[PDB]
Amino acid sequence: KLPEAYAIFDPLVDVLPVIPVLFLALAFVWQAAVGFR
Amino acid sequence: METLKITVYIVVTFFVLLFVFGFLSGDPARNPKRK
Amino acid sequence: SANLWERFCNWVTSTDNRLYVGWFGVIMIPTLLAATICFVIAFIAAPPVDIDGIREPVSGSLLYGNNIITGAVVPSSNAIGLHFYPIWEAASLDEWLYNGGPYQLIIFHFLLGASCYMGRQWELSYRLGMRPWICVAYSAPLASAFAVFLIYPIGQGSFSDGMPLGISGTFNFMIVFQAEHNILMHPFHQLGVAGVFGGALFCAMHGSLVTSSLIRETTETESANYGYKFGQEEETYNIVAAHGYFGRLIFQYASFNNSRSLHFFLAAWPVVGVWFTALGISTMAFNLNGFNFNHSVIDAKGNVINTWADIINRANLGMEVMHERNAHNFPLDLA
Amino acid sequence: GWFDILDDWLKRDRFVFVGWSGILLFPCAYLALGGWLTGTTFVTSWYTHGLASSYLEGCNFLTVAVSTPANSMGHSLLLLWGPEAQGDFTRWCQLGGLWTFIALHGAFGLIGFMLRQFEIARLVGVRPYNAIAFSAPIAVFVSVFLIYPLGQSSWFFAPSFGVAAIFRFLLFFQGFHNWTLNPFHMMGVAGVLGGALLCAIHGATVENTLFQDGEGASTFRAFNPTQAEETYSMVTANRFWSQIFGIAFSNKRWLHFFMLFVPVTGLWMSAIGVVGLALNLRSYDFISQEIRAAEDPEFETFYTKNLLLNEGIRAWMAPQDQPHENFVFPEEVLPRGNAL
Amino acid sequence: DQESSGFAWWAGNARLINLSGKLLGAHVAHAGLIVFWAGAMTLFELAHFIPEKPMYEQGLILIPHIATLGWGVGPGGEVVDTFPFFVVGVVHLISSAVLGFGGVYHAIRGPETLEEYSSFFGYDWKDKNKMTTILGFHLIVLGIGALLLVAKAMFFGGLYDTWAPGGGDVRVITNPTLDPRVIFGYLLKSPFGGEGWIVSVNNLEDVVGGHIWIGLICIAGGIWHILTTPFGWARRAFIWSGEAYLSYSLGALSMMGFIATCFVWFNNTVYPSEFYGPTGPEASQAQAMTFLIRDQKLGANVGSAQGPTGLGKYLMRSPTGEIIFGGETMRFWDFRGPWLEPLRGPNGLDLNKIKNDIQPWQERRAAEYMTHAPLGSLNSVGGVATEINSVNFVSPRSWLATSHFVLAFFFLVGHLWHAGRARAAAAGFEKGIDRESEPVLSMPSLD
Amino acid sequence: RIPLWIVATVAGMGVIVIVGLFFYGAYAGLGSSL
Amino acid sequence: MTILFQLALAALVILSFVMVIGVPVAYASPQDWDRSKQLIFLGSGLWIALVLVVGVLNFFVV
Amino acid sequence: VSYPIFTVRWVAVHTLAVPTIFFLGAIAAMQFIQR
Amino acid sequence: GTTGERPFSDIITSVRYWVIHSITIPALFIAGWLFVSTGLAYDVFGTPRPDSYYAQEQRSIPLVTDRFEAKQQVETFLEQLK
Ligand code: CLA
């Protein structure tokens, strides 16, 4: 039930919920680059 | 059986009181040296 | 004087009382004595208790046909459910006993004291100026005792379910739990086992290694133990000779060398792991059970190929079926 | 004369030590972990038992295994070149050769690894309370994967090297041996379970009794890997516990030996117990209870309750779990409660 | 920051205990992940949501919330219009960009201390007052929020009402329960079987009235705090530390976390069951309903029917005498639900009604629920553990209650962790015992 | 030459993929229930 | 109408993506924090307009 | 320093590394075997 | 203590390393992928292909029933499989 027009975003809309996890994972890439000061 | 209910509450209240006050009695204070 | 209360609060808080009664202890002390005393009597003498809902009374006490291994304090009745059944709510002790009143009295009290016991395990540390967290390591067992005695029942709807106070009825709780939740197949239990199994494994390691590097300070005809003196100045074994070996057993960096970093890994591994099982029982309390792979690996035509997951389930059914033989009237076990 | 030239080579402080013991420890160890990983993803348990035991078949990490050989095999070693396999590697895979292969190689692998603990210890000059401690696990594996089966009909009844393939071994025991009611297993538990408590109460006591030897909060650094004073205060600890549990240590040397005895001892008792179940010399029932319940139909204890669970576990499981027996239990025979 | 100067890498965020500017960005950026989620997931639900297939049968947990407020549902929770969903989902998804922009900004570009950048926003932990102020605001902010609900109910569309006289359907509450008695009653009602606690609440009048009764208390407090400072005992009672402030707020959440796990597992009202699955007890009840009906509608005389133990298959009595459903279900004789009440009398389930007043809508509703009970595996395989595959489903009621007990718990652990640390960082020894002056070493031995 | 924080994350996200391809295999695969 | 709308909404996507990689690198890179000051102001205003545009265009479609 | 290129450790690190990837590739291939 | 031989941190970071392995690793990955893909694996380990457990009927499992003549038994089992 995603209004037709937007239905060209299904694939994207399907992935959005996971993004937040990524942040915690990116925060680890950050410290890795900064050598865990 | 009712008397037993009364007793118990009286008894449970006595201790619940002691507990609440005892901490209110400035517990932080009790320790080697409160920096 | 100086108003006894002021004084009372100083004794209660005495940092040098054989046993540290604290503010938490002011509850732990009577609560645990009510539980412990009622348990001890219940276990020795006590009529059969109509555990399930029916009227098929089970006897757990000694004077009624049991031995230490079979005996137990039976869970309050199913007719009671989650309802609060204290002694004053009974028409007579006999009613209270036949319906399992002793159980509720004993668990509500043990859970209350065991909690304050956790709180007490902080108060003293504070009063002694030491770091806290010991009480947080003890939150694992407590959390497990909470799951099994309070959470699991709140989920299932009755204290009749929820591990019974007795050696054999503990095995009962398990053998049935399995059939109802296929727990062995739940991540949280496997982590529980890695924790409990792991914990032991490391307890042997730590205890092993250290003992293996004690500094020679005794003859051949006298305990190695005397080589240490209570409160003695410096360390009592070579933490470097220790790592010198363990490192070489596997490989240098696959080893410890920092007592602090090593000892923490000791208190974190089993605690984190045991927490989980508590979260498993607490989770499967709301019916999110273990993995289910029954009838997977189906072949080309549609024939079911059976994997070990099925021999499992096959043995689980056998449990599901025979348990509580006279308590079911309908097809599905939704309680 | 060259023995030494070799000894020298072997005992060289490399990344991964080797040793004479390694001339056994690695040939096997790898060769075993290897066979498991293989069988786990490629070989099947269809001719042996009657199930998919690998990845290639559709099984997942939990449901895979290198399942024991057919019962008709017996206690046969199943040597790739023996009467059975007749040299043919693939069939060897099908009759269950990969099991005795893993079992036996892993076996010598644990012998190897202990010799190692004994070789490295002699060199580095420390007491061997780690090869002694490791006897505990030898006992478990040597009695659960070797003695047990040798006592029964074939290898078919040994654990199978699989996650679920074990949970099955667990229930089977509860169902046919009524293990949980065995005093030896009980000790087993009391030890593994309390060995965990020691390994966690000690860890916490140390960490929350540390003196300050740093400025920051992450006190991990405050510990000089180099000698000197104890890092936490045994004196303060001994005090804590003694007032909050009545008893408390006060001899690091004894504390750490206890920590070795507890978990080790319990796995030993655990073993003796199984050595018993090999001869079905189990601790199944309490006769005093049976006689009573036979005569008086109103006597019920959590004991009897559990015994019915067993009847159920055997009745419904046996059939698919022991194929070579061609069991056929008509629906009217299957013991069942009401409704369910 | 650095370790050799601050804390330790895995303790990073404590390096911000004294850098409010950044500590604001931390809080803002995060408060964006929540919205982002609320938003991103609602669309994920909707994108899959199937207009006419039970919500509970579709793993939805957000849409169900929106529906209960009376948004795109109609009679029996018929999902009349999807838009409100799309609408709600996106708004959040955008407001996340806003908040997100603030966080990234305030924790990077912006000042890393509100000290001089603005003395009104700047704050002092030990400042036993600027805290009572900030608290005050927020205490008012929550109040406005509570009152928003009352609005959606008494003024904008109403809410869902399972107990709806005609039958489940949106309904505008216009008689909020005023009066402390009834309202506050729920406050001191045993949490045990039967008399539940807050989790009772079987009607929206109270849910609404209770909320009205909140702002006019919550905001009353939001003021009292912006206008005062902790009294004497208050000060000589708590530890005034940033970390300590956390702790108290940590236990708070945790405590509610349970109150929630219990709410979504037991209450039928503020969790329709038309959108969520059926209550656990509800389903165990419906299996009896289902067979008391099937067998009656087949010759049986349920009132007299006696089962294997002598209790009567279909009907038996409760400890206080009420006539309830028989079987293990004797434990759930507390369940109250729309589909069942019409069969209830003054002494409990009435026979006459049962014998000939059971409309078909119940026979099938009862069937729906017993076949949608809160049982399933991790890999979402509906039913008992011994069940075979097909019908993958796990009640929202399970997923919810399950997740929150984990969160709820760990937070209690968290509470101890910090309350215990901040309570010793104050006396000041959270880094080790002072070699030179070991308190223990100056205490009379016990032996 | 090649940074750690870049050898990691690459490999990291890498295994997250293979281990994810595995998790997909649960459904559809042979170990599926269809 | 949909052409307009789709491409409009599709703009709000790429622009947002760009903002995301930018603003951070922007705030983080003092190396011309005067140039991005402008750029960012573009993204921000523009983004909001885009949103408001798509909002209304939605109605002309659904 | 002048570290060697082929060491005993290299023999080890490869005996587990080579088979693994071979497997991870084989196992990743099964995910598409069906019916 | 004593820290000997070529270090990993370095080696992983070495451009030469990836030069060498950005050939070898995927090589192995595709090498094994074909092991399954080709169906070779099956034949190596006598593991049944989804269409080879029971011939159209025989709802009976092909269970090896005796050592010594064990193999001949398995063979005929595959035989029957038509
Ligand atoms: C309510 C919110 C909350 C807040 C604001 C804080 C805030 C703080 N905590 Mg506390 N904490 C909380 C809850 C909270 N905590 C809870 C519930 C627990 C119990 C588990 C803890 C346990 C805890 C510990 C043990 C420590 C802190 C510390 C700290 C301080 C430093 C932060 C840090 O080290 O980040 C760095 C964060 C990380 C290393 C990453 C998070 C890692 C977790 C384990 C992953 C969980 C992720 C996800 C759920 C699982 C992934 C999926 C899985 C299936 C694979 C900071 C003041 C530290 C301190 O110095 O104390 C003063 C410290 O040592 N906290």
Ligand code: CLA
């Ligand atoms: C998601 C929650 C979260 C949040 C909001 C914060 C926030 C913060 N952290 Mg913490 N942290 C977290 C999780 C979090 N952390 C975890 C899980 C860990 C354990 C690994 C740490 C470990 C940690 C350490 C070790 C340190 C901090 C520090 C800081 C502060 C300074 C930021 C900085 O130095 O950036 C550095 C800048 C960058 C390299 C840029 C990162 C990219 C940006 C921020 C993301 C852009 C987001 C998105 C993609 C774009 C949206 C754009 C759109 C709106 C247009 C800041 C208050 C520091 C501190 O305390 O300072 C004194 C510090 O030393 N944190």
Ligand code: CLA
């Ligand atoms: C957002 C939540 C909130 C918060 C965090 C605070 C916080 C605070 N309030 Mg405010 N307050 C609020 C809302 C809030 N209030 C509202 C809505 C009102 C109504 C207008 C008030 C009215 C108010 C007054 C009238 C006073 C305060 C005071 C205070 C301060 C100390 C008092 C105290 O905490 O005693 C803690 C409580 C005790 C020592 C008593 C324990 C014994 C009780 C009877 C048992 C509680 C048991 C509970 C029901 C069971 C669950 C327990 C659980 C552990 C299992 C403290 C800063 C005092 C102050 O200093 O003034 C500024 C004060 O006099 N507040």
Ligand SMILES: C=Cc1c(C)c2cc3nc(c4c5[nH]c(cc6nc(cc1[nH]2)C(C)=C6CC)c(C)c5C(=O)[C@@H]4C(=O)OC)[C@@H](CCC(=O)OC/C=C(\C)CCC[C@H](C)CCC[C@H](C)CCCC(C)C)[C@@H]3C
């Ligand atoms: C729960 C399971 C459990 C496991 C998995 C386990 C594992 C291990 N313990 C070791 C050590 C120890 N364990 C000890 C006490 C204990 N260990 C316990 C329980 C376990 N210990 C318990 C309960 C105790 C008593 C407290 C001590 C005292 C030591 C050590 O000193 C030693 C160590 O170094 O500590 C870290 C390591 C020895 C390495 C080795 O032998 O290589 C050689 C052998 C190899 C590589 C071949 C594997 C052999 C087996 C027979 C084959 C299994 C087959 C497959 C490979 C795997 C099966 C698959 C499963 C799905 C079932 C190894 C990691």
Ligand SMILES: CC1=C(/C=C/C(C)=C/C=C/C(C)=C/C=C/C=C(C)/C=C/C=C(C)/C=C/C2=C(C)CCCC2(C)C)C(C)(C)CCC1
């Ligand atoms: C048998 C045999 C043999 C040999 C062989 C071998 C030696 C092999 C090996 C093999 C190997 C050596 C293999 C391996 C494999 C592996 C794999 C397949 C792995 C995987 C993994 C994974 C999948 C992981 C994951 C994870 C985890 C666990 C946790 C953390 C996270 C992660 C996610 C990372 C011979 C010829 C003598 C003879 C006959 C028999």
Ligand SMILES: CC1=C(/C=C/C(C)=C/C=C/C(C)=C/C=C/C=C(C)/C=C/C=C(C)/C=C/C2=C(C)CCCC2(C)C)C(C)(C)CCC1
């Ligand atoms: C400080 C810090 C941090 C953090 C961060 C954060 C917390 C962030 C956030 C962020 C955020 C929070 C963001 C957000 C964003 C958003 C966006 C960007 C959005 C967008 C949207 C849109 C675009 C919409 C629309 C639509 C529609 C309507 C439909 C169709 C589809 C779409 C989707 C298109 C870290 C850890 C890293 C590190 C350190 C520092």
Ligand SMILES: CC1=C(/C=C/C(C)=C/C=C/C(C)=C/C=C/C=C(C)/C=C/C=C(C)/C=C/C2=C(C)CCCC2(C)C)C(C)(C)CCC1
């Ligand atoms: C697109 C889009 C959007 C937005 C977005 C966003 C807001 C994003 C974010 C994002 C993010 C935020 C991301 C992230 C990612 C991450 C990653 C991918 C990570 C990784 C990591 C790793 C792999 C690690 C590792 C490791 C290890 C294993 C070990 C230790 C060390 C280390 C840590 C290195 C929107 C809505 C508008 C719409 C359209 C589309």
Ligand SMILES: [Ca+2]
């Ligand atoms: Ca889709």
Ligand SMILES: [Fe+2]
């Ligand atoms: Fe130690």
